[PDB]
Amino acid sequence: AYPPYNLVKESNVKWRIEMALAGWSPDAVEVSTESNVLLIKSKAPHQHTDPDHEYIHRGVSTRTFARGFNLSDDVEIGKVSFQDGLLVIDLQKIIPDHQKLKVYEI
Amino acid sequence: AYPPYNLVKESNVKWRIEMALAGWSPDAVEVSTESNVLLIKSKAPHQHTDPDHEYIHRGVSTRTFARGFNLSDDVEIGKVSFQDGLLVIDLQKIIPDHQKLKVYEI
Amino acid sequence: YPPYNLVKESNVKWRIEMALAGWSPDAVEVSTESNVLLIKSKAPHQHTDPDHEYIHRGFARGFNLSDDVEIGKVSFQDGLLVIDLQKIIPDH
Amino acid sequence: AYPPYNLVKESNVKWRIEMALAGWSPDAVEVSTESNVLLAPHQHTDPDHEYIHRGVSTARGFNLSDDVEIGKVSFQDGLLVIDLQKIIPDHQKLKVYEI
Amino acid sequence: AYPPYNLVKESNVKWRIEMALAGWSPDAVEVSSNVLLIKSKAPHQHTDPDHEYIHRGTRTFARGFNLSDDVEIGKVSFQDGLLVIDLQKIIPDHQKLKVYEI
Amino acid sequence: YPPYNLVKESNVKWRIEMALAGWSPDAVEVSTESNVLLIKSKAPHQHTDPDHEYIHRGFARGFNLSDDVEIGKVSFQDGLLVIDLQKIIPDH
Amino acid sequence: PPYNLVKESNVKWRIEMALAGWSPDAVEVSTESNVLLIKSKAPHQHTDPDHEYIHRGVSTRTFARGFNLSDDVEIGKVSFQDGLLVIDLQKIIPDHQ
Amino acid sequence: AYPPYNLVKESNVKWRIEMALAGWSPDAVEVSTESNVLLIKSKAPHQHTDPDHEYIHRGVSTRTFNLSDDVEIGKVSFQDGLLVIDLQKIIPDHQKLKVYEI
Amino acid sequence: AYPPYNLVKESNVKWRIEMALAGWSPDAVEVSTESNVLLIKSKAPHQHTDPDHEYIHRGVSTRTFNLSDDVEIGKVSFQDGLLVIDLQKIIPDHQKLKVYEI
Amino acid sequence: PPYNLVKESNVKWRIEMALAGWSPDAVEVSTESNVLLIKSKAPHQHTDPDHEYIHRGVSTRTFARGFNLSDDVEIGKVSFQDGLLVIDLQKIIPDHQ
Amino acid sequence: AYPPYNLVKESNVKWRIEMALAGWSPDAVEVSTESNVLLIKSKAPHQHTDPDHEYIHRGVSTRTFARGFNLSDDVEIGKVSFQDGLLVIDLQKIIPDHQKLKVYEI
Amino acid sequence: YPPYNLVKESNVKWRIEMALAGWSPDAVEVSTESNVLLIKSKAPHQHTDPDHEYIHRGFARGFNLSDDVEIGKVSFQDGLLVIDLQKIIPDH
Amino acid sequence: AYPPYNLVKESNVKWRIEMALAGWSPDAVEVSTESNVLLAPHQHTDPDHEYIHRGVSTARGFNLSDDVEIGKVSFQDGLLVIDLQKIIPDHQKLKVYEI
Amino acid sequence: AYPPYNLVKESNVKWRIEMALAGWSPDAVEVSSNVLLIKSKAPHQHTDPDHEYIHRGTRTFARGFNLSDDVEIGKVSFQDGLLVIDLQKIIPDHQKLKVYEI
Amino acid sequence: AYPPYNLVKESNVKWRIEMALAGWSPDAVEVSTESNVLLIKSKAPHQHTDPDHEYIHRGVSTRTFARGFNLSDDVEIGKVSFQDGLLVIDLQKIIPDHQKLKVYEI
Amino acid sequence: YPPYNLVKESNVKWRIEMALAGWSPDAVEVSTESNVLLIKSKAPHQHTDPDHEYIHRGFARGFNLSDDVEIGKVSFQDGLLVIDLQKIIPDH
Amino acid sequence: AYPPYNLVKESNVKWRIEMALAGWSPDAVEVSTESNVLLAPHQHTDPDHEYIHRGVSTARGFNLSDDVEIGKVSFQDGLLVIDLQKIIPDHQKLKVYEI
Amino acid sequence: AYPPYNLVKESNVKWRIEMALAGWSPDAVEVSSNVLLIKSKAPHQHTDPDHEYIHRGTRTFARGFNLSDDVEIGKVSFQDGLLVIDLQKIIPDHQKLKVYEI
Amino acid sequence: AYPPYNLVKESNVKWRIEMALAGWSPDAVEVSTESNVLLAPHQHTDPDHEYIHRGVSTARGFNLSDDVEIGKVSFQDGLLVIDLQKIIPDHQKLKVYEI
Amino acid sequence: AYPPYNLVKESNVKWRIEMALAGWSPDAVEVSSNVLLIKSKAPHQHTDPDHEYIHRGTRTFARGFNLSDDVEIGKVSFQDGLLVIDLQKIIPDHQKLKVYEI
């Protein structure tokens, strides 16, 4: 029921999002960033009807959806690459300055 | 059982609250703001009794209620408009300065 | 259905109080049909808020009159309908 | 298996009965008004070979509200559409007052 | 509720269909690879309400039946809200009603 | 299995639209066998992301053709397969 | 009713049948469109006084029995004897035997 | 389930029996009268040894399956797999069917 | 459960009874004929008093357990724990096994 | 079939057995690898006309009965009388009695 | 099973805690404040035994318990009043400087 | 009901210990009736905190005495009632 | 208890039947092609003492797709491997066009 | 699905085993403290797909049976996909088929 | 199913972690600190197979696991002591400057 | 019970590997009894951490030996017990 | 169906029995004190026509605590109110000591 | 627990009601569109406790019965805690107790 | 209802049977060693009046591990305490090596 | 598991108790308002382990029985792990074993 999303966890600073949008034109698609909370909003602005001129079973269903995720501040965007009905968005932020992993006592 | 409330989500900065208070006088009603946590408190200060002089079925029930919601800081108020037993409260705050939604790579 | 309260002031008087919130004066048209009152509430606007922004949220009525009704007052105040009806004289 | 009946008020003076009767001719059907209540002359030996299975097969009362009368009955496209007319309640008055 | 329907079985060459369509005009209704389709499609009819008209005991319907080849149509008669369609085809050279000995 | 939509343009034409996301041109090889179309999707890479970093996440098809098919157009655009087939002439 | 089946050969199907009491005018057989229909229709009935008649086990009824044949099945002989129907059919020539 | 037999009750004295034995030769069948008790024995002398592959269905098949004094037998007519046995006996010297009053 | 007895049915007149009494001495067993009703009584005179520890299983054990006129007895042969009782009586003057027609 | 058991002493096990009708050629006993097998195999059968025979209670059947003995059990006597088998075994010498 | 605690909500700045400790000496009782997270720890340091010299049913049971609550910073203490086996602790903090509750438009 | 503990010091002595938290000296009045002790706890204030602010939160007793009782000490300390009773001499 | 059968298409012109028949010799087994459908001569009185329990014990049809033919049958290691060959559908053409 | 297997019981000295291994080559198969192990271990065989070959009705198996000491092997015969292993050992000095009196 | 971990709660400033890693070489083990969120990642880099030369039942199972815990900032490390297949990690941070536990009124 | 793994190096050798975490050298004492090995693990300290601070958290074994055992090596390394046993020569 | 009884202690010397007896006259009712335990003279043939359904229809013991006595019995408004008086336990003493 | 009540059915003109009100004073009780209402309303009575008085086996009640028009009241009698109300009205000109032939 | 038995190994050479036998004298009880397995002489007519209900009422085998022997049997306080002694397994050797 | 116990009922004056205490020394055991208490309280005994000694089929117990007044004790005998306590009191002046007429 959830459209088929995937989240790819690169480094300490970088998290990529992988997206299955097949048939979606770029005029339909709209992303939004409100207070470091990402809203991706697919909206069919042409609103293709469900006519029965001679149309059969439609298993794949698509019109208008909305999603939200509170990100840890202060997320920026790196790249977005539209390639064969998939979106690979690259978000790149986090500066803790404490990634040390070496201590021993025997 | 919850009195019939509605929350209306305007912009990135603005969130409106819609309120069904029918029969409530303004002396009864009391709102409260403690540490950016909104408490709306309807209190019947006249305390209308349930007499049986000749009174029948009372499906609509009303005396004293209390509600709470932790808002993200630093919420202020814009307008409140009492019009035919409804309250439309306009809250207007949020300054992220990162609402950019355009990046591509092919 | 909206939520209805009923009261007798006396045997003369029935008083109905009604929570209709958001309803406007053109949206409500009442009718009297066959010794039966019909309070109809019809939205004269296709209530469509912009789906993009707002989505997520949480009629006709008939009642027989017991000859012979005399309608008093009907007040549209603070989202309430307060109707005052009158009927007795049973001669007995 | 009774036919399917649909009843409606046009207004205060307009009942309307619409009725699906398929295959019914003009001498089989008979209506009667009895006590303020509205209410196959030759049948056939069906041949088994030709009549393997019919998927269709071919009295109904409704006590009237004082005091119903008739307007127009009309056979069209296998339906039955009966107009009935009655009112006088001496009460069709709408009243409202106050801000 | 799909409507209800009778099938008469005259000969081996002829199969007649009896369809129950009451209130249907003859521009709504449309008949059409050795497969028959009887489609009823409201072109110009009334939309219902909940105020004046309410309770009932009629929209658009389509039907399919894969017949053996190569069926033609004969005569369609619209009377008493009934469609009586005649279909006439088949010569299998095998309709032999026989065989008896002692 | 991927999710399949089916449409008749006319009786002539069947049009199939297909969501294959991430699939590449070498990964898809189609075949025609015994008046039956087989659309096979085989990963030509052992899809192994570095387990260390990425783990947690959320075929062949056969359909009989009704003599005699004429394949039109097949477009690999924006993660969709849009195939246009043709078959009628029943002489009747 | 109770039926039994035999393949003499690839050529031959034989159907054996128990019809007890059935008269020769009642029985009919049709070979319509490569589909056999063995009909058994009593023409009329017998005067049955429910007074002294008891627990009637034999439900006397008409029946039509259809079977879609493998193109294209033919009849050979039918012999009515000992209250049995022995029907001989004949078809093959599949060039695969 | 057993074979479907019918008993006709002609008179007080006479009882007729209708047996359904289809495809039974007359040397398999035998009837016995012992101690004023009848026994109708269907006894296959040898079962027709046949293959179970060519004969797809063998649901219905053929295998092997006290009166008031002083019973005699009238007739037994075997034709077209139906047995009709006529029995005629009973004398109580009391078969008067009369008496009526007000 | 009771002892496993078998009744052989020789003729209408003659009936034979086969009783299974293993390990039963002949003074325990007794047979009685009373009012044209037989009674075969197995009666242990004293039970062999034995210990229940050394004898692990005592599942199967030994304890204590209307004809048509005018029955007589023919023979009763006791050997290797099997009783074979020959009874021979029945005369209805009606044992004819004949009658056949077309 | 119905079996009974006895320990006369530490030396002695005795098995008492009801075999009714069994003939002397049918019965066999084997002492194989410190495991006793008392066999009861009817050599052939009897002509059984199902006509007048009724409710056969005695299911006549062949049976082989094995029991793993405590090393190392021996036979003493077997006496066939009154349709009983009385088998005497003898072993002890455990230096613990 | 929870010992019988009560929380009393005075003002926007003040929240009182009411406590049922009957028989508890003050040497036993120990409170703790770690990063504005209150830990009250009752510990029977005498560890009264359960002897059976002639002792009957003991429905009231008491030895060692521990509790925790993350408070909003930077909680301080006001008073604590030991009076008849009850503790009334007064915590007093919160400075939002936004408690305004009056806006209208008609 | 409040929670009650029971102890014998000896056969002479019963000692009852009682958790009554918030209870005051006027709120508790004890009675002796028919060789039966009745410890009654009655609120002499209608305990009504201001609903506006505070709402959400989480009797009589009779026991027969086994002739002849001698009441010792009863201490109201730190929300406890510690009563010391005395009864033996069975002459045997 | 029938034996276990496995059917496979090598290609468009290659069916392949593989068959487990253990203990089966070369005169017991008989195959037949009947109506476009592919389909123990002396048994033994097993001695009870030696044959306490066997844990193995020793007709099957499949209507063919017009119009199957035979290639090579081979007994090896107690299996049966039958090659069958047939095609001509007049249709083995792959077609695709567009960006 | 473990494969299926017969055990023949010649004498008290000899016990023959019959194993069902069809399609197994004689380098895969391997036989080996008075406990027999018949291991079948695929050394060089085909791996399956889901495209050309699909449905079936054969991997690696191992078996253990604690025999009384001190078993040796006699002859193993690989024919018709059957292994017939002969094992020949045992002299218990107790195979006495006797004892009868009156 | 969770490998057998234990958490030891020293002071207000110090929390120790106790770890059951038996058979794990130090080349396999890898810890990670991303934005004060500890990820301990055991990865068998030799990838010991499950051969059947003569190997029996293996109840103890070990290959690759990963764990995560969001710590309150700004966690540092104190000691780590590898001693008989156990790891005792000492984390030491928290400066509230409000640990006072003494107030009375009678 | 602690979790036990079992391996044959050959028929000669059994090798047992054992997760005993926190266990010390005085806490483990092994015994051989009646051709049966008993690995006993007894805490020589009453493991009592200060309840005040730490509370919340998440034996003997016998196995018969198959004459005649020869114990090889037993290594207490990194919280593992790796025992190497030896037994074959069946003369057959 | 017994009547409904309510028992009460006024004090240590005051039991009080209150009793609903509707339609009961002054010669039907009889009370008795037996063994330290407190415990329709002419009935009618009701006529079916007039007496379609009555929705009402018209011995009880309680062992007394040594040693109960009587005070005042009073018929008023169809009830029965019996005052009983007894005490002397030689023990009505309240005692308490300590801070 | 609603109280319990008897209805006596004198004539077709007269219907008498018998109400069970024990302990009720005559200022509490009140009787009143061709619909009778018998209301019992505590005006001056005692409120209960849980200390002195406890267990029981009496508050305020109201009753409605739509009678055919145009009922009047006759006499109400308060005795033995029973209310006996007399109502007397009805002339339907149809109380004919007849009709018999042969 | 058998008595209650408790078995224990003191060491490798020390079994110990402890046994509750209440009311049992010294001539009723008999023990026997049979085939490497360890295993009321005059009863009374109890009088019903005096013996209303007794709340107590008054052979057991255990195959021994080659080859058990006896030490000391002792009646004390209604119990039975049997010491048994046996070992020689030719194997009581503990061995361990490595860091 | 509470231990098990017999009660003997000599006369109306005398009731003897038989207690089952095996392994109990006479300093552990202690007997004591016309209510008898037989308390068994381990003073000096062994604590169990799980290594040497394990399975069983004995701690501290107390018992109470409200006897009619004013019971005294007679004799307590500790033999075969049984306590046989004698209690002797009661004169009700009513033990009359009589009353018969015709």
Residue numbers in the entry:
A (entry chain A), B (entry chain A), K (entry chain A), O (entry chain A): 44 to 149
C (entry chain B), F (entry chain B), L (entry chain B), P (entry chain B): 45 to 102, 108 to 141
D (entry chain D), M (entry chain D), Q (entry chain D), S (entry chain D): 44 to 82, 87 to 105, 109 to 149
E (entry chain C), N (entry chain C), R (entry chain C), T (entry chain C): 44 to 75, 78 to 102, 105 to 149
G (entry chain F), J (entry chain F): 46 to 142
H (entry chain E), I (entry chain E): 44 to 108, 113 to 149
Wording from the paper:
Small heat shock proteins (sHSPs) prevent the aggregation of cellular proteins during heat and other types of stress. Each subunit of the dimeric building block of sHSPs contains a conserved α-crystalline domain (ACD) flanked by a variable N-terminal arm and a short C-terminal extension. sHSPs from the cyanophage S-ShM2 (HspSP-ShM2) and its bacterial host Synechococcus sp. WH7803 were characterized by Bourrelle-Langlois et al.. The crystallographic and EM studies show that SM2 is capable of forming various types of oligomers, which vary in size and symmetry.
